[PDB]
Structures are given as structure tokens and as C-alpha cells.
Enzyme design. Structure first.
Site, mmCIF file in Angstrom:
data_model
loop_
_atom_site.group_PDB
_atom_site.id
_atom_site.type_symbol
_atom_site.label_atom_id
_atom_site.label_comp_id
_atom_site.label_asym_id
_atom_site.label_seq_id
_atom_site.Cartn_x
_atom_site.Cartn_y
_atom_site.Cartn_z
ATOM 1 N N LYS A 126 32.898 0.626 3.938
ATOM 2 C CA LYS A 126 32.007 0.981 2.848
ATOM 3 C C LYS A 126 32.709 2.139 2.122
ATOM 4 C CE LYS A 126 27.303 3.016 2.528
ATOM 5 N NZ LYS A 126 27.783 4.304 1.936
ATOM 6 N N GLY A 147 19.380 5.974 -5.298
ATOM 7 C CA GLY A 147 18.146 6.328 -5.995
ATOM 8 C C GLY A 147 16.965 5.415 -5.722
ATOM 9 N N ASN A 176 18.433 4.584 1.769
ATOM 10 C CA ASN A 176 18.723 5.685 2.679
ATOM 11 C C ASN A 176 17.617 6.733 2.647
ATOM 12 O OD1 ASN A 176 19.867 7.792 4.120
ATOM 13 N ND2 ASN A 176 21.928 7.152 3.549
ATOM 14 N N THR A 177 17.546 7.458 1.550
ATOM 15 C CA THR A 177 16.668 8.598 1.438
ATOM 16 C C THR A 177 15.208 8.157 1.455
ATOM 17 O OG1 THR A 177 18.336 9.799 0.197
ATOM 18 C CG2 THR A 177 16.057 10.473 -0.063
#
Lengths: 244, 89, 244, 89
Positions: free
Chosen positions: A100, A186, A207-208
Site C-alpha cells: 500500500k 476523509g 480508518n478514522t
């Protein structure tokens, strides 16, 4: 479902990928990957100590790591040179064949040119790549022609939760690119996943959004479902919007 | 002496210091010498007389696996970095 | 899953409702309702012959109508007086207790004031109502206080496929209203459903989106999945967007 | 005569006309009289000597179920509307 990507013997089935560098609890990681239906495990090294992300030693004990495809990432690196070094450390130390690839500066934003330079080098030694880029047609064609297995394309800034800032550009790019496109960056909620898939995305990387949902596990489950709903919607040929 | 870089995640064992001093000729001597001051760290680094598969050790930025593993040469003034495999984002 | 609404003995479980007045094929209706997981069957009369929507005679033969909750609609009417008349014809002729109340003029847009007037009349004779409104707080409170079982609130114009035009207003309304809110009007695809649910909607009503997808059946299946994904996402407490 | 309004969906049977003329004193006579011109329509309107549960018939806008059903009175000059239950949106 069918695999949306194959690299050698490795099959990617899950349409949600999950980055795991922000958790500090091994049971929670195990449980999030489970909830999200993930089949990819993301591994790296942190020469500069940017974070205190969990040790593979401690994860290997409590997770069935052999059930996942292992991919490397260079997302802690802050120079092109440092990414290449980390990529080659992951190859030598763990036998990672699939990377990645992330080349960002201090602004936590993919550097398109620098990424293309790093891809030429790593392709030349037979590394399989999923590079992260801003949605530039030229950049996306160069990486496709260099033999990248899929592209990751930025929806919006990292940890912004803003979803997809320029959907038309991402649509236009996916139309022109033969290889799979993963939307990433995002992504704030399940509706953003479904939006990503209705633009033609093969998968999404979150992710976040899971780290910062009140209930990480439920959001993981929601995005798993959003990905499949998103895909079906896309394939059903939705109605064109009637605007001015 | 040999200046040894500890990664954040293991600084628990070194009283929170990001660096330690040591003496030794092989990698394994440099480990044993650090264990003597900071108990518990060696357990994280070696397993069955071998470096943990999920641990990397460098001598002045050269991966020791290509150069002897635990038996790789350490001169005085060398820097020894510990770089564990970690969860990626 | 749990029921999101109960009127007497009738339970509403499916989070997608499906309007069926545009199909001209009985097998297709049967199949769409199946794909969407619908448990509500929508029935009316067409005094002015606005459309040629399928006969219940012909539907009853080929569908298991007893497995659905039957609700009436007054959406073909073009005056308040005509809606009330149709509502009372549906009561007398089919024993309909639950009405999808629509008062629109010739602009195919809910008339808030006229709808509130029709609700007072019909509540006074014990009719259970799901009225359609534009997102006005005052209007929504009046209907809640009159004992409406749920509100339907317009996302965007009918058959526009534009999704949700003013999401903040719909959020604000759902927060203030205790009873369930169904989002309806202009829903174009599965991503719009998930968006509706992340605003706090209990369910969504789709119509044109299924009629005009290249593959109605697949879009029906996608929206079913989007509704559940949407719900989970909402409950997981998604991250607030970081904007300017 | 009695002017009878046909709904679009049944105009197949009435050669596509939205209205027909007829003679009769009960509702059922007005039906039989229309059948004689336009075969097939009566089958859609009655079932086992009763109006179909999913069909409504009005005499000058009054629902005939409250007034005799098939046996409800029809004067000369009355309008008779057929209004079937249909799929709603």
C-alpha cells in the site's frame, strides 16, 4: 460475492479495507476487523516513532493473522526516500509482496509526482502496488501503465470526515481506468461508502471513521453493509438526477 | 560505547528513555548488556536463541539478518536501532 | 430488527416503503415488493383517471396480499376535498384504517396547511394518519399533537432523483418530533436512503427510483440493504465532520 | 338514458370510449344492458351474483352499497360511475 482483485494467489473479497494504526487495544482491533468483514491486514514500520501503533507480536497471539492477506504500507514515511526504504524493509523482514504505497510530505496529502517515481522503482523489482493518489487522470494512467494492481484515490483530507469532495472527478477517473479503484481519505460514515460505490469504486478504505465513531463496532458493521448496498445500487443503473 | 535507539512502544522497559548506552562486540552481547540494566526488554527481542520474527535490528542502518543476526559485529561507536513490525494505517 | 411503528395490531418492520402506482406488470410489482422486503401494500382510487395503475383484482390473484399491512393513499387527488372523499371511500370500501394522507395541488407538492386541515377532520373520526409535509417545524408539531402515527417529510421534488435538498432542516425536525419520520420524495438511489437514515429517519419511501433503475429488482435490493446500513451508521454515532 | 362512466383501465372492453349510454331501473339492469353491447365488462364488475369486493359503483356520486348494491335504484338521467380499487403511489 466475487473477488474484486487478485494478486497472484491472494484474493481480495471484502469491499471495506481497514487501517489499524490508531488503536491501542488488541481485542478491539480483532473485533473491528471482524465487524468490517476485513480480509486484509496492514503492516508497517515506524523508524521516526510517529505513533505507538500495536506490535505484530501482540496482535499475532490474539488474531488469526493467517486468514488475512498481508500488505505493507509506507504511510508513516515523510519522504519518498523513506517510503522506499520502509517498502524494502517490509519485503526483507516479512516477505511482503503487496504494498500500500504512500508518499506524502508533512501535509499528510499524497504527492502524485513523488508517488509515480516510487512506483517505477518498486515495479522494477516486481513489487505489487496499490498507490495512493489525488484524482489526476495523467497520474492514474501512468501508474496503470506501470502495472499497478489497483489505485487508491483521495475523496477528501485525512481524518476530515467530509466524505467525497469532488465526486465528478472521481467518477471520470474510474471510467477511464481499467484496474480497480479504491476510494480512501476523509470517509466519515456509511453513506460515504455507498456514495463511493455509486461512483464505480471497487472498494473503500476507512480508518478514522471507525476509530472515532461512538461505537466503532457498529460503524464497522454499517460500512460492510453500505459497501454491498452501494455496489448493488451501482449495478442496477440508478436514475439520472433531473436538475436545471 | 554503543548508542542504542529504543522505539517509543518499548520505552516502558527503559524507564521511558529513547536511548541507552552499552558495551559489546556482537548484537547479542549488546542485548544482554541492556537487559542487565533494564529487565524485560530481551524477552521482547529474542525467542528461542533467535531474533523475534517481528523484530528488526540495524547496525548503523544495516539490517543484521544479512550480516550474522544475533552474532553480527558491533564496533565501539556503532548505533544499534530496534525497529518492530507494527500495525499499519 | 424491531418494528419502527405499530398501529393497533399492525407492525411496520421494513424500513423501505414502496409505492406501486407506476408499474403496469403484476409479476414485476410482486417481485419489487419482494426484493425491497416491503411489508406495506398501498391502495387507492382514481376518480379523475390520472393514471392506469393496476387493479387489486389482478394483484390479489398473483400476490400474497394478506401478508401485507394495507394502507390507503389520497395521492391522486388534486384538492383537499377530493382527498377526504377518497380517504372515506377507502374506509367504506376496503375497511382501511391507516391512511397515507396526501394533499397536493397541481404542482405535485404537499400543501402543508391543507394537509393539516384534512388531518384534523380525519383524526376526529379515528383514522390513523401518515401525512406528507414539507419540513416545517410548526406543521410537524400540529400533526404530532393531532395524534398522527408518523410523518412523511419531503427530501426533494417528486421524481427528481435529487436526494435530500435541505438535510439540516430534516435533521432539526426529526430531533424535535417524537413520532417516527419517513423521508420521501426525490429519492434517486441507495446512497440517498443511507443519507436519510443518518439524519435520524425511521424509514424511507421510494417510488420512481425503482421504476426507473435499469434493473428495478437490484435497486430494490440495494435500498433494503442501504436502509439497514443507514440505521446502523446512525446508531454508531458517526464522527462529526471537520469543516472550516 | 343513464350515462355510465368507464375508468381508463376498463375502456378496453368499451372500444376505448370513456362513457356509454344505457337503460335500466336497478344497477344490475344497467350492467346487463352494457354487457349486451360490450361483452366482457360484466365479468370485471360482478362475482357470484355480487359486486366485486374491489369494485365500487356510484349513482350520482352515492355509493350503492349503502343503498341496495346491485338492486339499487337507477332513474333516467342518472350518472353511474365505476371506480375500481387500484395500486397506490
Amino acid at each position: 460475492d466475487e473477488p474484486w482483485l487478485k494478486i497472484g494467489a491472494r484474493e481480495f473479497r471484502s469491499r471495506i479495507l481497514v487501517g489499524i494504526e490508531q488503536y491501542d487495544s488488541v481485542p478491539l482491533v480483532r473485533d473491528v476487523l471482524n465487524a468490517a468483514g476485513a480480509d486484509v491486514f496492514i503492516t508497517t514500520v515506524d523508524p521516526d516513532n510517529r505513533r505507538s501503533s500495536l506490535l505484530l507480536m501482540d496482535l499475532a497471539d490474539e488474531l488469526p493473522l493467517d486468514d488475512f492477506t498481508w500488505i505493507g504500507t509506507t504511510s508513516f514515511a515523510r519522504t519518498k526516500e523513506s517510503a522506499l526504504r520502509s517498502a524494502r524493509i517490509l519485503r526483507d523482514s516479512l516477505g511482503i509482496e503487496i504494498l500500500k504505497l504512500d508518499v506524502r510530505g508533512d501535509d499528510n496529502t499524497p504527492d502524485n509526482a513523488g508517488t509515480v517515481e516510487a512506483a517505477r522503482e518498486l515495479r522494477a523489482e516486481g513489487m505489487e502496488l496499490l498507490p495512493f493518489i489525488l484524482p489526476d487522470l495523467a497520474t492514474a494512467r501512468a501508474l496503470e501503465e506501470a502495472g499497478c494492481a489497483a489505485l487508491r484515490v483521495m475523496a477528501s483530507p485525512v481524518a476530515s470526515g467530509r466524505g467525497i469532495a469532488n465526486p465528478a472527478a472521481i467518477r471520470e477517473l474510474i471510467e477511464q481506468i481499467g484496474i480497480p479503484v479504491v476510494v480512501e481519505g476523509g470517509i466519515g460514515s456509511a453513506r460515504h461508502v455507498a456514495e463511493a460505490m455509486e461512483l464505480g469504486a471497487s472498494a473503500t478504505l476507512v480508518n478514522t471513521a471507525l476509530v472515532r465513531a461512538e461505537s466503532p463496532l457498529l460503524m464497522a458493521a454499517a460500512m460492510r453493509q453500505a459497501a454491498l448496498a452501494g455496489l448493488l445500487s451501482y449495478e442496477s443503473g440508478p436514475m439520472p438526477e433531473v436538475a436545471a | 560505547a554503543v548508542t542504542v535507539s529504543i522505539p517509543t512502544i518499548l520505552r516502558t522497559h527503559t524507564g521511558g528513555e529513547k536511548s541507552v548506552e552499552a558495551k559489546g562486540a556482537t548484537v547479542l552481547e549488546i542485548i544482554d548488556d541492556v537487559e542487565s540494566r533494564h529487565a524485560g526488554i530481551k524477552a521482547r527481542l529474542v525467542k528461542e536463541e533467535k531474533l523475534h520474527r517481528f523484530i528488526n535490528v540495524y547496525v548503523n542502518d544495516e539490517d543484521v539478518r544479512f550480516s550474522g543476526g544475533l552474532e553480527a559485529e558491533v564496533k565501539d561507536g556503532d548505533t544499534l536501532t530496534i525497529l518492530p513490525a507494527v500495525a499499519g494505517g
